[PDB]
Amino acid sequence: ANPYISVANIMLQNYVKQREKYNYDTLKEQFTFIKNASTSIVYMQFANFMNIDNSLSPVIRYQKLYRRSINIISINNINNNEATVTFESLAQNNTGEILENMLWEAKIGFIMDSISTNMPFHFIVTSYKLKLLRNKNQ
Amino acid sequence: ANPYISVANIMLQNYVKQREKYNYDTLKEQFTFIKNASTSIVYMQFANFMNIDNSLSPVIRYQKLYRRSINIISINNINNNEATVTFESLAQNNTGEILENMLWEAKIGFIMDSISTSHNMPFHFIVTSYKLKLLRNKNQ
Secondary structure: OOOHHHHHHHHHHHHHHHHHOEOHHHHHHHHHHHHHHEOHHHHHHHHHHHOOOOOOOHHHHHOOOOEEEEEEEEEEEEEOOEEEEEEEEEEEOOOOOEEEEEEEEEEEEEEEOOOOOOOOOOEEEEEEEEEEEEEOOO | OOOHHHHHHHHHHHHHHHHHOEOHHHHHHHHHHHHHHEOHHHHHHHHHHHOOOOOOOHHHHHOOOOEEEEEEEEEEEEEOOEEEEEEEEEEEOOOOOEEEEEEEEEEEEEEOOOOOOOOOOHHHOEEEEEEEEEEEEOOO
């Protein structure tokens, strides 16, 4: 808990990048990552978003044609278990035609092992809520 | 608990992705990243591979047209300073014809700060050795 926040920020950036990216070819890996790094409730929110029954699912919106990439802009550490991560999303095809370019906030609740004074170290997201800040196209 | 390996794994994933991917438009950034995340010897190995005097340089093979993308498959942690990262590469043009689809192993030597209570990489992560082995051509 002098390096606790520096470590949490590495885990938080990684979680946002893995959760918010889209690549058809690595969907199974993405679901595995989220299931293991999240509570059941948080994972089910992700799965319900991704499910093809959601018309706004990236699987439906991007299919095999587009990738969505993510750039982390900043992190605000609220306390030991809450942070807000600001990030940009960019979606495009193999031609470089841009379907989305947006600025986002994720408000994240998390729990993480304490840092001591196989080397297991646990980090779990307990809450994850998105807010669109800006559509940098329109 | 000790976060060293869990953090190092995130650094190793990112290093492999940055090192092995190809995008003409971000070549300067890729070189800067590798320079700051590697020893001089390791950086020179990358730079010599990328140099257009190497006929197998991706700059010569993909030019402005193609991108090479990278998916990490697994990481085997051998000790605090050695890991083997298995990954797949995929190259495609503007219109998605597949030029390469291969499975690779990188054997990586590295160091990072001890993480403990009471242009640099996080925790001064540095790669001290990096050797590739082609495992399989998934295309032919």
